């Protein structure tokens, strides 16, 4: 395995701190270290990865593709790279952070994923959202619709997209505090189910081409002394 890393080091591009990377990789493999951090090394490629790692942190580099993820990865941080695609995700993954990259699609998402941060990309579609998902950032993308939302979702930041329809919620099957952000989109209508949502929802649909009928219904509903629905924000 050492020869593979040594041969990979032979590139030595300008700005690539590949010596630091060789040191960190060899240390990670020999000591069985749970975390491998190759951040801020301007790297363009990565060799075969230590297959015991729990967390791979490759933020702030020049990566365009990623190697095969270890079968037991819990966290993958690849923020601020040029990744146009990310490889197959291991089922043990619970945190995926690949924001500020060049992604248009995402692979199948492990059902036990808890955090997904993919803001600042060119996504046109999202896969089926994992059921254990709690935190999701998809703002600054090109999404036109959102998959139906899981039950345990607490934070959804979907502002600054190209959304046309309001997503399907989980029927208030969740009762904790949740904040859903949909501002700066193209949504023109809202479902009747909105009028049955609880105060535990904080929804921001500002900067949306909401129709006159939807706006008048929102004004009539929130102006009633009997409004115990979501903390709603709607402003153009």
């Amino acid at each position: 395995y050492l020869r593979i890393l040594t041969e990979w080091e032979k590139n030595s591009s300008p700005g690539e701190e590949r010596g630091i990377a060789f040191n960190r990789l060899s240390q990670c493999f020999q000591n069985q270290e749970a975390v491998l951090n190759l951040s801020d090394l301007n790297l363009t490629s990565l060799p075969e990865l230590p297959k015991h790692i729990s967390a791979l942190i490759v933020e702030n580099n020049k990566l365009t593709s990623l190697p095969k993820l270890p079968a037991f990865l819990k966290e993958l941080n690849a923020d601020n790279n040029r990744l146009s695609v990310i490889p197959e995700l291991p089922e043990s993954l619970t945190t995926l952070s690949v924001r500020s990259n060049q992604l248009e699609n995402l692979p199948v998402l492990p059902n036990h994923l808890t955090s997904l941060f993919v803001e600042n990309n060119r996504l046109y579609n999202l896969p089926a959202l994992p059921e254990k998902l709690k935190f999701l950032h998809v703002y600054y993308n090109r999404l036109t619709t959102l998959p139906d939302l899981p039950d345990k979702l607490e934070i959804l930041c979907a502002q600054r997209n190209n959304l046309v329809t309001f997503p399907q919620f989980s029927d208030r099957n969740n009762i904790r505090q949740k904040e859903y952000y949909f501002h700066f989109n193209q949504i023109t209508t809202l479902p009747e189910s909105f009028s049955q949502l609880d105060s535990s929802y904080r929804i921001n649909i500002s900067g949306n081409p909401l129709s006159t009928r939807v706006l008048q219904s929102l004004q009539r509903l929130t102006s009633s002394p009997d409004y115990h629905g979501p903390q709603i924000y709607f402003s153009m």
Binding site: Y139, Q159, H183, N204, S206, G207, Y233
Partner: peptide, 8 residues
């Protein structure tokens, strides 16, 4: 504006 436009 980019995180809580029109909010609190």
């Amino acid at each position: 504006k980019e995180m809580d436009a029109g909010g609190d």
